[PDB]
Amino acid sequence: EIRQNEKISYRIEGPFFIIHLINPDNLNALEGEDYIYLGELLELADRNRDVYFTIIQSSGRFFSSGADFKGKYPSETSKWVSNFVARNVYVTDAFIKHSKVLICCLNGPAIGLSAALVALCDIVYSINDKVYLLYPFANLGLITEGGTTVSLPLKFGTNTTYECLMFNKPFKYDIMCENGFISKNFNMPSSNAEAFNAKVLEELREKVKGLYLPSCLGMKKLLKSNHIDAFNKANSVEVNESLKYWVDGEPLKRAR
Amino acid sequence: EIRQNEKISYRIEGPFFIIHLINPDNLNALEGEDYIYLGELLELADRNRDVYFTIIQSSGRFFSSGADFKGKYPSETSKWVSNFVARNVYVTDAFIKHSKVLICCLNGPAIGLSAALVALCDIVYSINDKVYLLYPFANLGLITEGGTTVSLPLKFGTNTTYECLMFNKPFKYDIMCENGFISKNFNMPSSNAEAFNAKVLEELREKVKGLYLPSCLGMKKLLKSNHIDAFNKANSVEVNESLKYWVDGEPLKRAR
Amino acid sequence: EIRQNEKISYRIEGPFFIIHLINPDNLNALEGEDYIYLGELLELADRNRDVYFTIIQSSGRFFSSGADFKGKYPSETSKWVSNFVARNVYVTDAFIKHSKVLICCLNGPAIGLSAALVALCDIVYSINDKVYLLYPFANLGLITEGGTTVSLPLKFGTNTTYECLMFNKPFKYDIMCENGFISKNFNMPSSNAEAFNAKVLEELREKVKGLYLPSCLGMKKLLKSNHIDAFNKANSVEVNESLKYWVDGEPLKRARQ
Amino acid sequence: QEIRQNEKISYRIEGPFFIIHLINPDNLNALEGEDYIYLGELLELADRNRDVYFTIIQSSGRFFSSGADFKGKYPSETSKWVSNFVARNVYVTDAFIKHSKVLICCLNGPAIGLSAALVALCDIVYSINDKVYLLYPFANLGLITEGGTTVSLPLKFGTNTTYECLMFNKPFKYDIMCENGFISKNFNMPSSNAEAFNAKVLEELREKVKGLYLPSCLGMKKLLKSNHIDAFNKANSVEVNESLKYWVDGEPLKRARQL
Amino acid sequence: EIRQNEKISYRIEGPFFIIHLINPDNLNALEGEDYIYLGELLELADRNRDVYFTIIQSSGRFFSSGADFKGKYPSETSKWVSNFVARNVYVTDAFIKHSKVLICCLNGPAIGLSAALVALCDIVYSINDKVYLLYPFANLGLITEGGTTVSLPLKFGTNTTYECLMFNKPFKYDIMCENGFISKNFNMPSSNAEAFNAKVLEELREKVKGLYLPSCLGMKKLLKSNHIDAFNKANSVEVNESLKYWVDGEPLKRARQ
Amino acid sequence: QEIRQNEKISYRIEGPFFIIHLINPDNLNALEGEDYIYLGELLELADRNRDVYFTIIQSSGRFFSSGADFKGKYPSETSKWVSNFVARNVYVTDAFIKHSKVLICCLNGPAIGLSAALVALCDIVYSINDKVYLLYPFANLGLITEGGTTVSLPLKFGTNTTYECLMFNKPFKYDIMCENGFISKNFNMPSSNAEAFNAKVLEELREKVKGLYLPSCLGMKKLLKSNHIDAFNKANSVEVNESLKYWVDGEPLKRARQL
């Protein structure tokens, strides 16, 4: 039981807790409170003993274009602590610690904090070879977010990570496939995300047959311990280091 | 240059950036924005190339009784993320990363988050043997804050830390002295914090004569690297784990 | 629900799961299966949602004199893997990962693997100033066990640990107190462990009044993460490195004298 | 160089090479607990021999090893499994983790389960042909990660690929092995002559070591091992202890009796 | 402001500090003092607040053939501490800690300590698909240098690293590309390193347009923290462990042939 | 057991003990760069001797060692200091960090600077009497932490005490040493007979090792060392490189010429 959000729905089918970004007209751009809502959904899925997989699906041609930049305080610092710092530490933490198998259905590109979240998922399936991830921090006057400090070198390599981050270049489909970031490309048309989403769920129902599901969670629990400390450390430092960029004002100015 | 705060002042004398909690009538209890203000002062001291020591002094009989519990949101979670999570990650981070030598003049007891901050200082001087630190998390329905997860076992030992934290008992003067937590007890009366504060500064002016001050900072930089990762990791996890305690409501109920 | 063991009992009183070593006539020396039993009891306490504290108490003048050295295999290696390696790695792990507050009531000396278990507890109370911990590995032809590789330097300091371990010397009461290892000395006579055990429980019932007990567990969960990895790494290495000492035969030959 | 004999596993020394041979092709080189222990004892023996610089693990038939032999006294279920499963796994895993000689696996066919974990702990792997695969069927058996796979699989195959394969009981196939540089050379020989493959690897190795200062190999390995030695030791202890509740719950046993 | 070195030049163009190995007739082989000079140039670039990228370029058909083996002490140990240990620990540290984005323009092969420095760069661009990195330590009677203990497994994988290091085999272009080690291959002829160097700089001037350059440094500062400790630990151990190989004499005797 | 002679430092072996003796009391056992290197070579020699289980460091006179001797060709200031300071410090510090034999310091009087760092890297310290102290005067010399003090001082004395002493150039006095268990036994002998102290320590050590299985001592030390070995190796590299800018800036030199 949780409040409703017009941009994001969820349902449970058997062992699957399915989260759906449902605002395709705005490329599923997300405001601060929507990221918090996502964290609350993960925490809900995490407390449900019938759930073994948490599946994040979207809508339209984009997975998510990232933070919504369309959408009181004693200082600039106090403002940004409340608005940026808090939201980012919270949602990043919710993904880092999540105990269920986290699967992203990548129906199109993801950008920024949303793309950070994709990189925190355990398994990623792509609609087709036109998906990409973009982390435009250098263009926005920002730094790494959502644990990308750790996740990008981990999943794409350190050298590739520098090229992409330092020069604001996308991690394209080819780079994703070369690094095993995508576990399966479904090769379906971008115009039917809904069909892609349904097909992934159908294959998942097939793939879990016969498995002892608590083994999945037991294995994940050990696997997570490989990098949990690095992610926790990066979360705190990412969010605090970002502050001077917001307080300096550059990302605001750039928000044109 | 920074806004004024009636509860906390600062000044610079030579290589010393001196912060003064000046609200003795309320035992220097601090609201969220005051903790943020403290962080901003540290960040200011840290950017000043003439500053080598950041000295935190208080007033009255208490160093600080902790968070002021006398002193809109889509959910309980969103509320507490904004109010508790953000403030705590920010201020704790400001202390953890501070590059100047941090000295606390402990003019009386410190409690809770304020006492966490005392434990993050590099050097602590006590007014007299009646000072103590209390971390009442078990009584408040909360958990460790302000990096105490790491600082208390580090500076007091693991066994002593469990006895005190699990049973809501103070770290008294004797325990502080036995662990070398206090570098000097000035043995002055509790009724003149001002005299104590002045005496510490006078001794400091003497002790820095002849020293190559950049050596102090160079040494601190290496020393800090011993535990910086543990503190950063604990900061993120403390603040996120606390959330369920606030959201469950217990600390509020207890706030009687 | 678990098998009975005549050397070790347990009961639950409110939020306390109380384990009692009850073989004072043999100084509560423990065989392999007894150490395993202890691990099983911890795992039972850990699964009980009404338990917040696991309290380990003993009987007589000793907490425990350690492994009972009075008390089928293709090789010496296979034998010792089954008998020593497995038992040690299991019981040590049960202590390292335990989520309830672990309190040891130290009613007298502890030796060897039993003393290692004392050093893995979160809080230790002593009956009087004659208690000591002895880790006689250098004398037995063995090495560090039960996570002592980590726990001793952590709770006693590195230099003191080397003096004691390298020369088979006890960590005496004064050293325990100087390092805050003991949270309270009850100063009671050695002849009444029972009274000491009761007195600790009585104080604990008082001390928990008013506390939010889930906070205790929440704080412990974070505190444990400071050293959990070091303990897990040491456990694996301790048990495997011991093997060559058992297989070489020295601790056996030293046992016969 | 003295140790008991084991009809399923032989060893010999040729120059700087200590060569271990799984020789039970009729049963796909499936291994019982004591055989895994025996393997650990052989590694410890190679490790103490100052003339040995490389420890080479070779097999026979069409499989490297189908894993633990599931065809093949205790106060409790816990005591039983501590003795049988916990002890064997911690010991053999440790023997591979700490081994100081260059460990080379000659992969003559598929490996499964704990045997496949051991392949993933080797320093260098050569494949007979592109039909080899590694399968870690823990999710199907009602078990969890073993033999340091918690660390080795993400390390050598990537995290995302590891989750897909482990969570859904899918093999790490040749293509994935090649894409991740897991296999250093595919010999492209027929599956029907493991023997020829084994001999060819050794013949190339004798060529490749000519002119090398062999203590440099060990000196380098000693530094390389330190990158992950702690993570492996931590995983070993946790893997074996966490597995216990799966054995004690009984699921893997049940699943065994359903063939 | 720094001394001149006839083998290595530098200049600054906007936000780029450009270092150029300019001794193609000797395959840009470097003596101890040249490696030290390189470290000094990095430290200079690192202190210049207008610099955001430090670009290392070379000349001819090789990036660098490595340490120049053509080119007073109480002991063999004292000699090698002064000559090998000190130089290696200093230059390796200068690369590990560098705060500006470090880009290598790989105009041909690199060998040994020079190849180690390539592997410490943040981004590498290749002239064409004939480049390779060779770390011939097993052949020279040496061990890992310049942080390769960490960088090679990190950027090439553990198994590939063992094959190459244990058997003195090159990390060839295909391996580099498969691991994303090379961010762009320019596919230009080996005969014009100069054109390649110019082309990389031209693209870089384009790629930085519109970027907030302090963001680059801020991101690097966080990225570096992933492995900084492993690199610092390896540096100390690599240099000290090499010593016995030099003192034993093997690399010397191998040098004479 | 063969090495050059050094008039300032001798060594001998008595049974399982390798005993190193600083023998220059007239100059407070102050040590030049090459003497620190020599010490490292002696540790490496003791470390290779299979009959040695304990390495005992003893001195002479009223001081253990007053530290680096400041009475006692390069393309740059940087090259000079890399050769003279960096190399010497990384080498000797490393020799202590990695030493596998039980290292015992017989503290016959004060130790200062790098020599005091080396005392703090020993496993066990015995004091002649309660007038010993350790001083780390880096802040006064215009230097930073050396010889692994970055790690050893907080580890053995606590963080807060370490900041008070290092930041303000104050000694770690006997009381602080005793309170932190840094000293395992104070012999309470007069400062005028270091020799008698040295002999008494050795006599007790011969008593204390009777009946022990000495390989157990080394086996235990090997596991104990792994608690902090990484932190020490990381600190060594950073300490020596960070120091460079202090030497190159020139401050410690200036401060040297002001006696």
Coordinates of C-alpha atoms in Angstrom, one line a residue, chain E residues 48-255:
Chain E
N48 CA 48.7 24.5 -13.8
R49 CA 45.1 25.6 -13.3
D50 CA 44.5 26.3 -17.0
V51 CA 45.3 22.7 -17.8
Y52 CA 42.5 20.1 -18.0
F53 CA 44.1 17.4 -20.2
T54 CA 47.7 16.1 -20.3
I55 CA 48.4 14.5 -23.6
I56 CA 51.3 12.2 -24.1
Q57 CA 52.5 11.9 -27.7
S58 CA 55.5 10.3 -29.3
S59 CA 57.5 10.1 -32.5
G60 CA 58.4 7.6 -35.2
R61 CA 57.3 4.0 -35.4
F62 CA 57.5 3.2 -31.7
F63 CA 55.7 4.9 -28.8
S64 CA 58.7 3.8 -26.7
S65 CA 60.8 0.6 -26.6
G66 CA 61.0 1.1 -22.9
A67 CA 64.0 1.5 -20.5
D68 CA 67.2 2.2 -22.3
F69 CA 69.4 -0.8 -21.4
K70 CA 72.6 0.7 -22.8
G71 CA 72.3 3.5 -20.2
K72 CA 79.8 4.9 -5.9
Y73 CA 77.5 2.5 -3.8
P74 CA 78.1 0.6 -0.6
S75 CA 76.2 -2.5 -2.0
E76 CA 74.3 -3.9 -4.9
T77 CA 71.2 -3.2 -2.9
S78 CA 72.1 0.5 -2.3
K79 CA 72.8 0.9 -6.0
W80 CA 69.5 -0.6 -7.2
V81 CA 67.5 1.3 -4.5
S82 CA 68.9 4.5 -5.8
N83 CA 68.7 3.7 -9.5
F84 CA 65.7 1.5 -10.0
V85 CA 63.5 1.6 -6.9
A86 CA 63.5 5.4 -6.6
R87 CA 62.9 6.2 -10.2
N88 CA 60.1 3.6 -10.6
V89 CA 58.2 4.6 -7.4
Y90 CA 58.4 8.3 -8.3
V91 CA 57.2 8.1 -11.9
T92 CA 54.5 5.6 -11.2
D93 CA 53.2 7.7 -8.4
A94 CA 53.2 10.8 -10.6
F95 CA 50.9 9.0 -13.1
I96 CA 48.7 7.4 -10.4
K97 CA 47.9 10.6 -8.7
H98 CA 47.6 12.9 -11.7
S99 CA 44.4 15.0 -11.5
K100 CA 44.2 16.1 -15.2
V101 CA 42.7 13.8 -17.8
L102 CA 45.6 11.8 -19.1
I103 CA 45.5 10.8 -22.8
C104 CA 48.0 8.7 -24.6
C105 CA 48.5 8.9 -28.4
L106 CA 49.8 5.5 -29.2
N107 CA 51.8 5.9 -32.4
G108 CA 53.3 2.5 -32.3
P109 CA 54.3 -0.2 -29.8
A110 CA 55.2 0.4 -26.2
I111 CA 57.4 -1.9 -24.2
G112 CA 58.1 -2.4 -20.5
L113 CA 57.9 0.5 -18.1
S114 CA 56.8 2.8 -21.0
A115 CA 54.0 0.4 -21.8
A116 CA 53.0 0.5 -18.0
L117 CA 52.6 4.2 -18.3
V118 CA 50.3 3.8 -21.3
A119 CA 48.2 1.5 -19.2
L120 CA 48.0 4.1 -16.4
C121 CA 46.5 6.7 -18.8
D122 CA 42.8 7.5 -18.7
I123 CA 42.2 7.3 -22.5
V124 CA 44.3 5.8 -25.3
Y125 CA 44.0 6.5 -29.0
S126 CA 45.9 4.3 -31.5
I127 CA 47.5 5.3 -34.8
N128 CA 46.5 2.0 -36.4
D129 CA 45.9 -1.7 -35.8
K130 CA 49.5 -2.6 -35.6
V131 CA 50.1 -1.1 -32.2
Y132 CA 50.8 -3.5 -29.3
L133 CA 51.9 -3.4 -25.7
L134 CA 54.6 -5.8 -24.6
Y135 CA 55.6 -6.4 -21.0
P136 CA 58.6 -8.6 -21.3
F137 CA 59.3 -9.1 -17.5
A138 CA 59.5 -12.9 -17.7
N139 CA 62.1 -12.6 -20.3
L140 CA 64.2 -10.0 -18.6
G141 CA 64.2 -11.8 -15.3
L142 CA 62.0 -9.1 -13.7
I143 CA 58.4 -8.6 -12.4
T144 CA 55.5 -6.3 -12.8
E145 CA 56.3 -2.6 -13.0
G146 CA 54.6 0.8 -13.1
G147 CA 51.4 -0.5 -11.6
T148 CA 50.8 -3.2 -14.1
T149 CA 50.0 -5.6 -11.2
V150 CA 46.7 -3.7 -11.0
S151 CA 46.3 -2.0 -14.5
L152 CA 46.6 -5.1 -16.6
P153 CA 44.0 -7.3 -14.9
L154 CA 41.8 -4.2 -14.6
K155 CA 41.9 -3.2 -18.3
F156 CA 42.5 -6.6 -20.0
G157 CA 41.1 -9.2 -17.6
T158 CA 43.0 -11.5 -15.3
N159 CA 43.2 -14.6 -17.6
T160 CA 44.5 -12.6 -20.6
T161 CA 47.0 -10.9 -18.3
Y162 CA 48.4 -14.2 -17.1
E163 CA 48.8 -15.6 -20.6
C164 CA 50.6 -12.4 -21.7
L165 CA 52.7 -11.8 -18.7
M166 CA 53.6 -15.5 -17.9
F167 CA 54.7 -16.2 -21.5
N168 CA 56.0 -12.8 -22.6
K169 CA 53.4 -12.3 -25.2
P170 CA 52.1 -8.9 -26.4
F171 CA 48.7 -7.4 -25.8
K172 CA 47.9 -6.9 -29.4
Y173 CA 45.5 -4.5 -31.1
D174 CA 42.6 -7.0 -31.2
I175 CA 42.9 -7.6 -27.4
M176 CA 43.1 -3.9 -26.8
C177 CA 39.9 -3.3 -28.9
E178 CA 38.0 -6.2 -27.4
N179 CA 38.6 -4.7 -23.9
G180 CA 37.8 -1.2 -24.9
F181 CA 41.4 -0.2 -24.1
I182 CA 41.6 1.9 -27.2
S183 CA 38.9 4.6 -27.5
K184 CA 39.6 5.3 -31.1
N185 CA 41.8 3.8 -33.8
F186 CA 42.7 6.5 -36.3
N187 CA 43.8 4.1 -39.0
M188 CA 46.7 6.2 -40.3
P189 CA 50.0 5.0 -41.6
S190 CA 52.9 4.3 -39.2
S191 CA 55.1 6.5 -41.2
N192 CA 53.4 9.7 -40.0
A193 CA 53.1 9.9 -36.2
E194 CA 53.1 13.7 -36.7
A195 CA 49.9 13.7 -38.6
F196 CA 48.3 11.3 -36.1
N197 CA 49.4 13.5 -33.2
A198 CA 47.9 16.6 -35.0
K199 CA 44.7 14.8 -35.9
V200 CA 44.1 13.7 -32.3
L201 CA 44.6 17.3 -31.0
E202 CA 42.3 18.6 -33.7
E203 CA 39.6 16.2 -32.6
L204 CA 40.1 17.0 -29.0
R205 CA 39.7 20.8 -29.6
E206 CA 36.4 19.9 -31.2
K207 CA 35.3 17.5 -28.5
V208 CA 35.9 19.9 -25.6
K209 CA 33.7 22.6 -27.1
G210 CA 30.7 23.3 -24.9
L211 CA 31.9 21.2 -22.0
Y212 CA 32.3 22.5 -18.5
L213 CA 35.9 21.5 -18.0
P214 CA 35.9 21.5 -14.2
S215 CA 33.3 18.8 -14.5
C216 CA 35.8 16.6 -16.2
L217 CA 38.3 17.0 -13.3
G218 CA 35.5 16.5 -10.7
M219 CA 34.4 13.3 -12.3
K220 CA 38.0 12.1 -12.6
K221 CA 38.6 12.8 -9.0
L222 CA 35.8 10.4 -8.1
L223 CA 36.7 7.8 -10.7
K224 CA 40.3 7.7 -9.5
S225 CA 39.1 6.8 -6.0
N226 CA 37.9 3.4 -7.3
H227 CA 41.5 2.0 -7.5
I228 CA 43.8 4.6 -6.0
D229 CA 44.6 2.5 -3.0
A230 CA 45.3 -0.7 -5.0
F231 CA 47.7 1.3 -7.2
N232 CA 49.5 2.9 -4.3
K233 CA 49.9 -0.5 -2.6
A234 CA 51.1 -2.1 -5.8
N235 CA 53.7 0.6 -6.4
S236 CA 55.4 0.1 -3.1
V237 CA 55.4 -3.7 -3.5
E238 CA 56.4 -3.8 -7.1
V239 CA 59.5 -1.6 -6.6
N240 CA 60.7 -3.5 -3.5
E241 CA 60.0 -6.9 -4.8
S242 CA 62.0 -6.2 -8.0
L243 CA 65.0 -5.5 -6.0
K244 CA 65.9 -9.1 -5.4
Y245 CA 65.8 -9.7 -9.1
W246 CA 68.3 -6.9 -9.8
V247 CA 70.5 -7.9 -6.8
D248 CA 70.4 -11.6 -7.8
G249 CA 71.9 -10.3 -11.2
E250 CA 69.7 -12.2 -13.7
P251 CA 68.3 -9.1 -15.5
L252 CA 71.9 -7.8 -15.9
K253 CA 73.3 -11.0 -17.3
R254 CA 70.2 -11.2 -19.6
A255 CA 71.0 -7.6 -20.7

